Design a protein around this ligand. Structure first.
Ligand code: PLP
Lengths: 418, 465, 138, 47, 27
């Protein structure tokens, strides 16, 4: 064996790497520190921009009912709950909000989470163990594909919004694991994608799920309250009895203008989740004023359908204007409220193109005052869907600002990209 | 670390054996009578233990956390299965939620400012922090945290657990090691896994043992390929909750600068409580705040808000700002919570005017020290060090938990008891936690009540006085 | 540490006793409840125990906790003890107990027959289970 | 609360017989009494 | 014959006790 004298040098001429790679130059580019409500027409640097990167499709930011409800809850409740929901973190407003969400969608019971990304990750690890099978979708954002990694199951991706590949993958899976017959089989999907902005077709997913006894885990956070005919979700859109889906998740950051997210499903699932999750039994609870704002927003959505319709027309109009753009082309679904623009004929290494997009967005803000958002990936995000600039069109946008947006986009893009 | 009386150990083992045995009987007859298209997700442990005790958890309240809050009564209907919080409520004593400095209610300085900022910027904004989630309040928050923690930079997140789970993958990866500590938060454990790093463990702040593992591990080269690893990170916590005990800083720091390992402090429970000024453990134990490379904390347990932060070298903050997933993807921290953090730090630093915040620390010192000394005197088994405001009393049996919790509730005192899976088998705590909002009278009352209940349940393990 | 809630509890002061005390108790109660000779009680004890432990250790594959997803998805409890550090003191005790049980339960019924054959079989299988070589092997 | 009462209760909670349902408690209660009967009668005859 | 089994098992306990712990091997 080794001697105690020998170990001393082996622990002496070892030398570790620096904690972080050296800072380069690209890294410093400041966000636009802005001073107002981040509504449609916010203000930054004392100028007056037209916001297009804030995800409040329904335009509930600044509404007065949310203001008054939050004021009253803040006065009588404080700002924090100070404990995890397992010990003494359950205020009455939390249970009222859960009952309200369940009544909205239509479901036995619900649950609330303290943070948006939290839902995704806690939920997926709670529902699939070491030996299961998951058929993911290759376009799932980081939140979903962190939970997919945490639950040490067997993940098998398929093409982005391709049902032929879904059928082929399902048949292959049935061939592979024919003998053993106990494993559960999930299909993690997403209503409207952040990376591409196209709507999943749920009719065919349901049909293939029935034939092969799989289960769905749908993340409808960009469709809840915006997509359907009344705001119920994707189910309305593709009109399917909503207990077909087994788990439905959402984040309340976008439409409801509050924080945290929920996870709706039948009783069984729900209780299970409730007692043996990880981002629920260990973390603190939502501050009660956020839950109060959430309830107020849900009722406002429920009793005011006109904005839903209005939103759809607004997106229509934007598409109409951007239709004729030379350098780069729309690649999103005609209805979804994310007007994704994908650049054509990529120059080369993706770093150069992404820097090109950042320069374009910065130029847009500096010259025409029009905040937009250009896709950004870490070195931990494994998406390989093309980069581009997104546009979170909303219901509070006039025609004039919209119009102007297209105009500016067009001009800048064409000239700089050609 | 813990003195286990013999007959108590034997009784604990026998009682758990008896539960497992009735459990089995019940389950098997259920099954047989059951036998007389998607696979089912669901059982034994949860069903048995939790159903026997589930009126002691998730108690809903109907007011703000305070010294005295009101607890909702809850009836069970068809035999002990779904407790339905009805109407009608009590009025307890808050020995549950931690809010050390008493910041979760409504004082004069913070709440009007928070309301005004809510009116100006409205609830939450709608984006991430790179695009449109950066308001002036966030900038003020970052400067205040930088000036209050000490280190040259900081970034604030929206959730502590998310903070750890999204930051640990960034710093270390495939080919690195994480000598964690035996008991930590689960988020840190998860964070470790989130990457491809091997996870070793030393033994609760016995630096000697850390030294041995460290040397040994460094020799042993890699796992089974014998390359040298590229990074080693040592994760510790400021005051280890549910054990009371505080951390051995100077020792650990010198051992970590022996063998070129990196440090990762976690001062969640101890960023507002301990400190002659209220700075944490780096002020209490006199450790220079440059020998640690990352400090993570949480605004929940002391400031009455909901967030989480990272402070470190000014290079590390830029690297995280450009590569941390929970910075690029997640929605920014709500504005009212940001300005409450600002207001609370302004109060602690004595930047609000009169000397209100200069005596909250004085209050917590007296309260914690007097309560801990008295519980020691009466004959209990309170754990921990001498000036951290957590003092878990210790029970050791499963049936002792419903008895103690229910008795305390009946005499209008709310506590928090921790069961089997969250602990080892034998160790069954019931952790009190003092605030700088309890008055002398309330502490006297709770001492009388806990003494009566301990007399009636036989938990005065150490000799009386 | 052992970092496993389901197998680390076999290390605190007292476990070894409890065990004996439970068996002793078992004997007592069985003979008392219905008239039996001590040898009958010990055989009744031995087979009871055979069933009890053999099932648990050697057929319960997995863990009940959801802390770790499935990282011990298939390993009998006996395969998880002491983190697979074969032939440690705890393992030696768990192996030793059936031997003393067999010896006394056979002796006190001084090898007649029905009982003797039953227990022969018993101890046999239990000892077979263990064995250092036999590991992760059907 | 009386001496015997107190004792009963304390013993109940030590041996984990608090959380069982009445019948489980009943059954287990009895067993010890049977045991004792057996022992004293046997002791009587053995001495 | 009691003696043979008892003696064999006695040396059995001796064998099991006298041995020593050892890790399983790698690949
Ligand atoms: C209490 C505690 C938390 C709680 O975090 P929140 O996100 O504020 O709920 C996280 N980590 C550690 C180490 C803790 O002690």
């Amino acid at each position: 064996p080794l001697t105690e004298q020998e170990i001393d040098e082996l622990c002496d001429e070892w030398v570790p790497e620096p904690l972080i790679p050296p800072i380069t130059e690209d890294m410093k580019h400041e966000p636009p520190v802005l001073e107002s409500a981040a509504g449609p027409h916010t203000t930054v640097n004392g100028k007056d921009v037209v916001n297009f990167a804030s995800a409040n499709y329904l335009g509930l930011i600044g509404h007065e009912k949310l203001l008054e409800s939050c004021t009253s809850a803040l006065e009588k409740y404080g700002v924090g709950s100070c404990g995890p929901r397992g010990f003494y973190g359950t205020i009455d407003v939390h249970l009222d909000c859960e009952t309200r969400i369940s009544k909205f969608l239509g479901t036995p019971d619900s649950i609330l989470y303290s943070y948006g990304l939290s839902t995704m990750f806690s939920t997926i690890p709670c529902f699939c163990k070491k030996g299961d099978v998951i058929v993911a979708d290759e376009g799932v954002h980081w939140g979903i594909q962190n939970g997919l990694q945490l639950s040490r199951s067997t993940i098998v991706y398929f093409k982005h919004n391709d049902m032929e590949s879904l059928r082929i993958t399902l048949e292959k899976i049935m061939t592979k694991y024919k003998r053993s017959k106990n494993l559960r089989r999930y299909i993690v999907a997403e209503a409207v994608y952040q990376n591409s902005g196209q709507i999943a077709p749920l009719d065919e997913i349901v049909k293939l799920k029935e034939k092969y006894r799989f289960r769905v885990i749908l993340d409808e956070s960009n469709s809840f309250g915006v997509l359907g005919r009344s705001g119920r979700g994707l189910a309305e859109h593709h009109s399917v009895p909503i207990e077909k889906i087994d788990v439905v998740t959402a984040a309340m950051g976008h439409a409801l203008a509050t924080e945290g997210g929920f996870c709706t499903g039948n009783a069984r699932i729900i209780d299970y989740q409730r007692l043996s999750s990880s981002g629920y039994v260990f973390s603190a609870s939502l501050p009660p004023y956020l839950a109060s704002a959430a309830i107020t927003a849900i009722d406002v959505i429920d009793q005011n359908p006109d904005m839903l319709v209005k939103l759809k027309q607004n997106v229509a109009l934007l598409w109409k204007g951007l239709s004729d753009i030379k350098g780069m082309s729309l690649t999103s679904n005609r209805e979804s409220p994310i007007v994704f623009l994908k650049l054509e004929k990529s120059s080369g290494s993706a770093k150069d193109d992404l820097l090109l997009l950042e320069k374009m967005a910065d130029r847009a803000l500096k010259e025409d005052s029009l905040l937009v958002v250009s896709s950004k990936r870490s070195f931990l995000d494994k998406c390989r869907l093309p980069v581009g600039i997104k546009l979170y069109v909303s219901a509070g946008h006039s025609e004039s600002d919209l119009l102007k947006a297209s105009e500016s986009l067009k001009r800048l893009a064409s000239e700089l990209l050609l | 670390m813990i003195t286990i009386p013999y007959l108590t150990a034997v009784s604990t083992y026998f009682s758990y054996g008896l539960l497992f045995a009735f459990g089995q009987l019940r389950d098997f007859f259920r099954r047989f009578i059951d036998w007389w298209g998607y696979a089912p997700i669901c059982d034994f442990y949860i069903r048995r233990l939790y159903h026997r005790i589930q009126d002691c958890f998730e108690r809903p309240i109907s007011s703000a956390p305070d010294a005295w809050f009101d607890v909702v009564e809850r009836y069970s209907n068809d035999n002990n299965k779904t407790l339905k919080r009805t109407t009608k409520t009590s009025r307890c004593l808050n020995l549950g939620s931690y809010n050390y400095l008493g910041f979760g209610s409504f004082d004069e300085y913070c709440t009007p400012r928070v309301i005004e900022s809510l009116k100006k910027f409205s609830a939450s904004t709608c984006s991430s922090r790179v695009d449109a989630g950066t308001t002036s309040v966030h900038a003020e928050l970052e400067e205040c945290v930088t000036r209050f923690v000490g280190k040259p930079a900081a970034v604030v997140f929206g959730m502590g657990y998310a903070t750890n789970s999204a930051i640990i993958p960034v710093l270390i990866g495939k080919g690195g090691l994480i000598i964690s500590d035996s008991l930590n938060h689960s988020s840190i454990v998860n964070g470790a896994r989130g990457s491809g790093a091997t996870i070793r463990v030393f033994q609760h702040n016995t630096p000697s043992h850390l030294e041995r593992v460290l040397r040994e591990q460094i020799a042993e080269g890699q796992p089974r390929t014998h390359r040298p690893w590229k990074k080693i990170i040592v994760v510790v916590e400021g005051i280890y909750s549910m054990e009371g005990e505080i951390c051995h800083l100077p020792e650990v720091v010198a051992i970590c600068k022996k063998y070129k390992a990196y440090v990762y402090l976690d001062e969640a429970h101890s960023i507002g409580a301990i400190g002659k000024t209220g700075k944490g453990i780096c002020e209490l134990l006199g450790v220079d705040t440059a020998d640690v490379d990352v400090m993570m904390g949480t605004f929940t347990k002391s400031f009455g808000s909901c967030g989480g932060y990272i402070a470190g070298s000014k290079e590390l903050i830029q690297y995280l700002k450009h590569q941390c997933p929970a910075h690029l993807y997640a929605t920014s921290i709500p504005t009212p919570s940001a300005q409450q953090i600002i207001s609370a730090i302004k109060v602690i630093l004595g930047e609000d005017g009169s000397n209100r915040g200069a005596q909250k620390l004085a209050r917590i010192r007296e309260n914690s020290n007097f309560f801990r000394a008295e519980l020691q005197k009466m004959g209990f088994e309170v754990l921990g060090d001498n000036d951290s405001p957590v003092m878990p009393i210790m029970l050791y049996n499963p049936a002792k938990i419903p008895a103690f919790s229910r008795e305390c509730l009946r005499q209008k005192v709310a506590v928090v008891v921790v069961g089997f899976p969250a602990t080892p088998l034998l160790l069954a705590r019931a952790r009190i936690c003092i605030s700088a909002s309890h008055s002398r009278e309330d502490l006297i009352r709770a001492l009388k009540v806990i003494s009566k209940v301990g007399d009636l349940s036989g938990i005065k393990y150490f000799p009386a006085e | 540490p052992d970092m496993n809630r389901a197998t680390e509890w076999f290390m605190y002061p007292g476990v070894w006793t409890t065990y004996m005390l439970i068996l002793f108790f078992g004997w007592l109660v069985v003979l008392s409840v219905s008239g039996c000779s001590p040898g009958m009680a010990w055989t009744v004890v031995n087979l009871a125990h055979f069933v009890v432990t053999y099932h648990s250790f050697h057929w319960m594959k997995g863990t009940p906790f959801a802390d770790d997803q499935g990282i011990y998805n298939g390993l009998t409890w006996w395969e998880q003890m002491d983190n697979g550090q074969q032939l440690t003191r705890n393992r030696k005790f768990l192996t030793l107990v059936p031997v003393v049980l067999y010896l006394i339960a056979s002796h006190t019924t001084d090898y007649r027959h029905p009982w003797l054959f039953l227990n022969t079989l018993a101890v046999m299988v239990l000892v077979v289970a263990k064995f250092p070589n036999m590991h992760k092997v059907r | 609360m009386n001496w015997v009462q107190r004792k009963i209760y304390l013993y109940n909670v030590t041996f984990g017989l608090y959380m069982l349902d009445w019948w489980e408690r009943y059954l287990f209660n009895s067993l010890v009494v049977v045991l004792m009967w057996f022992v004293l009668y046997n002791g009587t005859r053995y001495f | 014959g009691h003696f043979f089994v008892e003696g064999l098992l006695g040396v059995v306990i001796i064998i099991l006790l006298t041995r020593k712990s050892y890790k399983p091997p790698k690949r």
